[PDB]
Structure formats: structure tokens, C-alpha cells
């Protein structure tokens, strides 16, 4: 897997962000996670977590997995990094996201995220409380 350059266009919600990649705007869906919808519990906190994390980052990187970089709604599917910290793993670690949507061929960081979910669950953080 390789990290590639991108720049924040706009925060959207817990697990989607509008980025500019190779000079084009694109909405990205965070791989292997599921944040609550805004109007669900911890939804607003998930949005705020992700928003602050991307908005404060001096360096935004996009990391595709091995299969299909686009979803059926045309959203980019990627791992996103804010100054070298993975937003996908960061939400799960805080129990603001669940490991979810684990499709074979786009699952490189699955065990890494499940590790973070185990610890979040262990600490009864947010979603697990
Ligand atoms: C995370 C992810 C979601 N999706 C699709 C499956 C879901 O389809 P359905 O709409 O048919 O449920 C939807 C969930 O996204 P949201 O959690 O953003 O709603 O996005 C993928 O196809 N691949 C993925 O890696
Ligand atoms: Ca979601």
C-alpha cells in the first residue's frame, strides 16, 4: 500500500470527507469503518472528531487498498491519514466507529482496526459504554 497526496476540500461526516486528489475533487468513504449517522447517537461526535482531525492536519494523504477505489455511489474508498495518523483507525480506537464493510480484496488494515476496536471496547469508549 502507498500514501498519496491530497488536500482537504471539506469535512462531511464521521466516515466521509471531500478531498482534492490528482487535481480533481472527490468524496471519500473511509474503508472498513462505520460511524453513526449524524442524527444517531455519537453521530455528531464522530463528525466533529473526523472534521477536527482533517481540518487541523498540515498533511492529508490518501491510501488505496488492493481492490476497487470507487464504490457504487462513486465515492472514493481509501484509508485517510492526517499528519501520518490514520483517521480510520483513530475513530475506531475512540469507539466513535465500528469495524464494518469488510470486503475481501479491500481489507489490508482489518486486523489493525479490530485491534483498535478491541481496546475501545475494553475501555467502554463512547459507542461501547
Ligand atoms: C465502506 C463501504 C461501503 N460500501 C457501500 C455499502 C453500503 O451500501 P448500501 O447503501 O446498499 O447499504 C454503503 C454504506 O455507506 P454509508 O455507511 O456511508 O451509508 O456503501 C461499499 O460498497 N464498499 C465499502 O467499502
Ligand atoms: Ca456511516
Ligand 2 centroid to residue 29 C-alpha, Å? 9
Name the experiment that determined this structure: X-ray
Phi/psi of residue 13, nearest 5 degrees: -150, -165
Resolution (A): 2.1
Give the whole-angstrom CA distance, residue 71 versus residue 69.
7
Give the whole-angstrom CA distance, residue 102 versus residue 8.
26
Q: Any idea which ligand is nearest the CA of 43?
A: 2
Give the whole-angstrom CA distance, residue 87 versus residue 98.
13
C-alpha cell at 98: 465500528
Kindly report the protein residue whose alpha carbon is nearest to atom 8 of ligand 1: 72
Ligand 1 pocket, CB under 6 A: 29, 31, 34, 71-72, 77, 101, 103, 106
Amino acid at each position: 500500500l502507498h500514501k498519496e497526496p491530497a488536500t482537504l476540500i471539506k469535512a462531511i461526516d464521521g466516515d466521509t470527507v471531500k478531498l482534492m486528489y490528482k487535481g480533481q475533487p472527490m468524496t471519500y468513504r473511509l474503508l472498513l469503518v462505520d460511524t453513526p449517522e449524524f442524527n444517531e447517537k455519537y453521530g455528531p461526535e464522530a463528525s466533529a472528531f473526523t472534521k477536527k482531525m482533517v481540518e487541523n492536519a498540515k498533511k492529508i494523504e490518501v491510501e488505496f487498498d488492493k481492490g476497487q477505489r470507487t464504490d457504487k455511489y462513486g465515492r472514493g474508498l481509501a484509508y485517510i491519514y492526517a499528519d501520518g495518523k490514520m483517521v480510520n483507525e483513530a475513530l475506531v480506537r475512540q469507539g466513535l466507529a465500528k469495524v464494518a464493510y469488510v470486503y475481501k480484496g479491500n481489507n489490508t488494515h482489518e486486523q489493525l482496526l479490530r485491534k483498535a476496536e478491541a481496546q475501545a471496547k475494553k475501555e467502554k469508549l463512547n459507542i461501547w459504554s
